[PDB]
Amino acid sequence: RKPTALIILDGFGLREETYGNAVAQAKKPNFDGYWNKFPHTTLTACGEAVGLPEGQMGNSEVGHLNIGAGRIVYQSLTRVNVAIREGEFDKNETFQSAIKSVKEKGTALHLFGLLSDGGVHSHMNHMFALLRLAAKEGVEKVYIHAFLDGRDVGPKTAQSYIDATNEVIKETGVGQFATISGRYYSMDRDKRWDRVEKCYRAMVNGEGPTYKSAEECVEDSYANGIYDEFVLPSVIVNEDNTPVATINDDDAVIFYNFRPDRAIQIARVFTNGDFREFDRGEKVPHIPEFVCMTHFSETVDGYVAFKPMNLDNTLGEVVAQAGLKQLRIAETEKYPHVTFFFSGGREAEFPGEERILINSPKVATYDLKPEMSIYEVTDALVNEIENDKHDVIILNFANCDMVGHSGMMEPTIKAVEATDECLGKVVEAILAKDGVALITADHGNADEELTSEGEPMTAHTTNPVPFIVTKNDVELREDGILGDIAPTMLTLLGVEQPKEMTGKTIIK
């Protein structure tokens, strides 16, 4: 029974520069011996290679979700961003069907969501692309309901955003501010229905304070000490005091927010049908093409533009199917990583899965114990190998990431060399059983402990991650990403790669 071990060093990145590099300044004869004797390569663990925005360093949770998945696992904000960039956003059937109804029903399209560049719950640029799409498709009427932020951005910045919106209205030809409500009114997540009622009553019944524009609203709202986040649901009215737009029968709505939580409540009030949480009166608009950017919860009734990644056949699942026995193990700090996240955000154990947990030292910020729990984890793992009981091993050595957040060099060197020692121990044991090790990392950290001017560097890095295969005669690709690793384990294991794993094997 020849064990195939995936070994995640964690916070261990590859950097040519030696200043501030705890990895390079650490004596690692075991890692260097394996690099020099076995086929090796580097893999990008960062930006869009792992479903994140470009430039942005990876983190344990998307790293391991990516590694287990054998595909690029996109995050919400980057998912849509790529769809707008690559011009797939506008082929989107759900938008198109909802724009269609408007044209043949002779009705309005409504735009609502958090109006700002914050990138947490929404991005305004997403609404802009929605303005462009409607405008191109020839929709006569498009109304904007500003949900004001003040939280994910500066507290007094809605005007800079209203201005940016007007620019997009000028260039696009469609678009008109009809309602402004502060997020505290529209983005409650604590079941405070009296605040949510208020925002609603503005949108469908036209009830609240009235203004000639959105800038006038925000100007007057500011004058009474009330700012962005707290601004009362207000109505924009034409030259006469008539509401610019209310949401009526057969109007389409697109809630561009992408974050489930503070979005749920206002979505429910439009979509459900049999809602009863508060009384919505008599003018309940219904029969709708209500669109959400993403899926908010089972509790919502409308349509989804970017449906969730169902993440079916991850590494865990596929090896379980082949009838193979598998082992997840780490100390507490990375235990949810080799389990939950590696399994594709899945709590439960697969068939043939065993999970072992080594308690992390009773300790604060982990630089005082640069060794953490490795030696106990190491011991228990050589035990299992000795015992021939698993075909696939998932191990994370947590030390470089947790000690590397210290931005302290000497403790982090200790941690790389403790990690070094244990990886020889784990890999000798694996090779002893005629098995194969994949030595990797999920992102970097320990490699940059000092910055430009020798200040503490306490974050992950952008750097490539190493990739060794302890199998003598294999060629390895140079591109390499994290979604490629699962597929290359199935190459070693000789089990077929399923449709849902869009990653490619590294073995040429």
Residues that bind Mn ion (CB under 5 A): 10, 60, 401, 442
Question: Residue 251 and residue 206: Cα distance in Å, rounded?
Answer: 15
**Torsion sign across C-alpha atoms 157, 159, 164, 169:** positive
Report in angstroms how near the CB of residue 342 gets to Mn ion at its nearest. 12
Cβ pair 264, 271 in contact under 8 A: no
Helix (H, G, I), strand (E, B) or coil at 195: helix
* CB closer to Mn ion, 59 vs 265: 59
Quote the distance between the C-alpha of residue 497 and its chain's center. 25
* CB closer to Mn ion, 265 vs 440: 440
Report in angstroms how near the CB of residue 248 gets to Mn ion at its nearest. 50
Report in angstroms how near the CB of residue 338 gets to Mn ion at its nearest. 11
Report in angstroms how near the CB of residue 448 gets to Mn ion at its nearest. 13
* CB closer to Mn ion, 391 vs 401: 401
**DSSP class of residue 202?**
H
Helix then strand count (H, E) for the chain reads 17, 15
Question: Residue 317 and residue 337: Cα distance in Å, rounded?
Answer: 16
Q: Tell whether residue 151 is among the known ligand binding residues.
A: yes
Catalytic residue among 60, 186, 234, 360: 60
Identify which of 371, 485, 489, 348 has the alpha carbon closest to the alpha carbon of residue 420: 371
Report in angstroms how near the CB of residue 81 gets to Mn ion at its nearest. 24
Identify which of 435, 485, 337 has the alpha carbon closest to the alpha carbon of residue 427: 435
Q: Tell whether residue 194 is among the known ligand binding residues.
A: no
Q: Tell whether residue 186 is among the known ligand binding residues.
A: no
Report in angstroms how near the CB of residue 404 gets to Mn ion at its nearest. 8
Those residues whose C-beta lies under 8 Å from the C-beta of residue 95, and which sit 6 or more positions away, are 89, 130, 133, 254, 291, 305
Q: Tell whether residue 334 is among the known ligand binding residues.
A: yes
* CB closer to Mn ion, 10 vs 228: 10
Q: Tell whether residue 152 is among the known ligand binding residues.
A: yes
* CB closer to Mn ion, 317 vs 442: 442
* CB closer to Mn ion, 72 vs 178: 72
Angle between the N-to-C axes of helices 29-37 and 409-432, in degrees from 0 to 180, rounded to the nearest 10:
50
Report residue 419 as tokens.
Answer: 């990690």
Backbone angles phi, psi at 371, to 5 degrees: -85, -20
Catalytic annotation on 101? no
Q: Tell whether residue 346 is among the known ligand binding residues.
A: no
Report in angstroms how near the CB of residue 443 gets to Mn ion at its nearest. 5
Query: For the residues of 71-135, what is the DSSP string, one character each?
Result: S----HHHHHHHHHHTT-TTT-HHHHHHHHHHHHHT--EEEEEE-SS--SS--HHHHHHHHHHHH
Residues in the chain: 508
Q: Tell whether residue 117 is among the known ligand binding residues.
A: no
Q: Tell whether residue 259 is among the known ligand binding residues.
A: yes
Give the count of alpha carbons within 13 A of 129, CB side only: 21
* CB closer to Mn ion, 72 vs 446: 446
CA distances to 109, 111, 235 from 244, rounded to whole Å, are 13, 14, 8
Number of neighbours of residue 478 by Cβ within 10 angstroms: 9
* CB closer to Mn ion, 367 vs 442: 442
Number of neighbours of residue 364 by Cβ within 10 angstroms: 8
Buried b (16+ CB within 10 A) or exposed e, 102-122: beeeebbbbbbbbbbebbbbb
Q: Tell whether residue 123 is among the known ligand binding residues.
A: no
What residues form DSSP beta bridges with 253?
110, 290
What residues form DSSP beta bridges with 439?
7, 468
Q: Tell whether residue 240 is among the known ligand binding residues.
A: no
* CB closer to Mn ion, 12 vs 95: 12
Q: Tell whether residue 10 is among the known ligand binding residues.
A: yes
Report in angstroms how near the CB of residue 453 gets to Mn ion at its nearest. 23
Report in angstroms how near the CB of residue 330 gets to Mn ion at its nearest. 11
Question: Residue 213 and residue 162: Cα distance in Å, rounded?
Answer: 10
Cβ pair 429, 479 in contact under 8 A: no
**Closest residue by beta carbon to Mn ion:** 60
For the annotated binding site, the residues are: 10, 60, 121, 151-152, 183, 189, 259-262, 334, 401, 405, 442-443, 460
Q: Which residue ranges make up the annotated binding site for Mn(2+)?
A: 10, 60, 401, 405, 442-443, 460
Residues belonging to the active site: 60
Annotated binding site for substrate, which residues?
A: 121, 151-152, 183, 189, 259-262, 334
